Amino acid sequence: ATGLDDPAKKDIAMQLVSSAENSTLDWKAQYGYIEDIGDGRGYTAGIIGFCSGTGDMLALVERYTDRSPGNVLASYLPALREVDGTDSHDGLDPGFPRDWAEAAKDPVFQQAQNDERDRVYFDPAVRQAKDDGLGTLGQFAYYDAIVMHGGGGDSTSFGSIRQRALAEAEPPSRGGDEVAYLDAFLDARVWAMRQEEAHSDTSRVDTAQRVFLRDGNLNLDPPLDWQVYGDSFHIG
Incomplete structure (x- = not known):
């Protein structure tokens, strides 16, 4: 305390x-944020800028899926595992940003973001x-x-x-x-x-x-x- x-x-x-x-x-406004800003990290998203290219977006979605099986982002796990280490959008486009924004409405995804920020x-x-x-x-x-x-x-x-x-x-x-x-x-x-x-x-x-x-x-x-x-x- x-x-x-x-x-x-x-x-x-x-x-x-x-x-x-x-x-x-207003840090919470970023839960649903997602863009590829052209820095080589692929999609950057969420409250700390988790990236598809650096492994931390992947770890986040894995943890969300452990807590919430068959959530909207779960189908993207094979793709996220594959593009990890690169700026590729293969298997993510066209639907990933839409689905990210939808997931951000889920308090469970929000908590998953909080918990990964805190862990790391x-x-x-x-x-x-x-x-x-x-x-x-x-x-x-x-x-x-x-x-x-x-x-x-x-x-x-x-x-x-x-x-x-x-x-x-x-x-x-x-x-x-x-x-x-x-x-x-x-x-x-x-x-x-x-x-x-x-x-x-x-x-x-x-x-x-x-x-x-x-x-x-x-x-x-x-x-x-x-x-x-x-x-x-x-x-x-």
Whole structure:
């Protein structure tokens, strides 16, 4: 019941991430979203942008189908298993986007999306932050990082960002000052964003996370006011 695991704080986290990914606090509006944006990942869909090309859409539909056999997306499993690793729409078109939108009306699919987001991103990020001895803000910083950068082994992954920060500063779990460590983590996060795109817009740190940190809002308590990409947001 503590930190970002508090239901109210958890939803604040989801809103904060949504402001950067969707330019709105309304993260749930994305349950039914589905498009191929031409990034090589095939169809990108749902609340975290599950992809047909990367395996996570497949894992999501498998889990939905375990809980709800013969649901509308179940017929697409052979195709999803086949196109995995590629941007191909073979076996998905023409009906997949329509059927995705229909499934998104099912609270069970919505819960499946929530649970996959939490299995891959939220639970690991919050658990690692708490182990490092960080408060709610720090827990949020880890979550936003893993959402954008993933939990892989690559040079700008969440794990790699964390390792960079630990080299510059000790975490509270090892006697370090929390503000100094969080400044190091945000530095590392910005370093990674710039590696992935040179002229990256780092506002989700610069005019949000760094601002909360400078305000000493270590427990991430409303009112929260921030900007991402120049749009202003407020949670009272």
